[PDB]
Design a protein around this ligand. Sequence first.
Ligand SMILES: O=P(O)(O)O[C@H]1[C@@H](OP(=O)(O)O)[C@@H](OP(=O)(O)O)[C@@H](OP(=O)(O)O)[C@@H](OP(=O)(O)O)[C@H]1OP(=O)(O)O
Ligand SMILES: O=P(O)(O)O[C@H]1[C@@H](OP(=O)(O)O)[C@@H](OP(=O)(O)O)[C@@H](OP(=O)(O)O)[C@@H](OP(=O)(O)O)[C@H]1OP(=O)(O)O
Lengths: 121, 121
Amino acid sequence: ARASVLSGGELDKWEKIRLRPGGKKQYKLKHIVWASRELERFAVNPGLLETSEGCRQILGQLQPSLQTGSEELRSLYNTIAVLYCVHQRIDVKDTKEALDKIEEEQNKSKKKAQQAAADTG
Amino acid sequence: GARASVLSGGELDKWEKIRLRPGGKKQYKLKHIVWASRELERFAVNPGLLETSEGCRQILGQLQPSLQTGSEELRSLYNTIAVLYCVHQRIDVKDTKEALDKIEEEQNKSKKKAQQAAADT
Ligand SMILES: O=P(O)(O)O[C@H]1[C@@H](OP(=O)(O)O)[C@@H](OP(=O)(O)O)[C@@H](OP(=O)(O)O)[C@@H](OP(=O)(O)O)[C@H]1OP(=O)(O)O
Ligand SMILES: O=P(O)(O)O[C@H]1[C@@H](OP(=O)(O)O)[C@@H](OP(=O)(O)O)[C@@H](OP(=O)(O)O)[C@@H](OP(=O)(O)O)[C@H]1OP(=O)(O)O
């Protein structure tokens, strides 16, 4: 699960992203292996880490449990959030920025969906 | 019509400076409150809920699922009540677009303070 999930280029940008905004630990291979084993624990298909859409669907499954979520649950969500941004080639420098951008991309997409339907005709 | 129970004095003078469209010339008037009031009755929604920040919030939650497929009338009604909410909340807006952006920004920050409140146990 250390070569199927990310490409070579994806990995090099993965290993520069910091776990927390003002911290110097960064993401490693071990966080990919861990998230993989975690999803199986949660009865989720780990193969979905391999793509943007797969990651999106995982975050959709996990979102409802996020506010009451344990630290393990929150760490798993944040990791997959960073993976999604990587797959999308959205630049991020830490976990918080990936969450902000995913939030920003959900608003943009819902906006364009409303404009597209509204201007239909 | 009168329907002068919805906005106070300070609120009415802010209402009438807000533009219907972000860079437009027409601004909200008393006839837009009268109209929104009658529109809600026709949608079988309590128009007295226009009189408070909490009332407008509950209306927006009622109408939101219908928004993407809504007609111009439905969208106009939603937009009008989004501005009223911002007026009641003393959120400074200058047009309908900004009112919608700030409601979304407010929902984002409440959901994350709630996630941080629980996350700190
Ligand atoms: O390959 P390097 O010369 O070692 O520089 C890279 C990198 O810069 P690049 O993206 O151009 O490779 C980092 O930060 P960003 O530029 O992505 O913002 C980071 O910079 P910091 O000094 O701020 O940490 C750090 O430079 P350095 O190795 O001197 O500490 C990093 O190496 P790391 O990714 O392992 O931190
Ligand atoms: O006669 P006024 O009521 O004083 O209208 C003027 C003004 O127009 P003038 O520059 O010609 O005086 C502005 O609008 P524009 O003509 O440039 O479009 C301004 O507009 P904003 O609301 O965007 O700030 C505002 O209009 P409003 O009536 O909404 O307050 C403002 O005068 P006030 O300082 O009296 O508001």
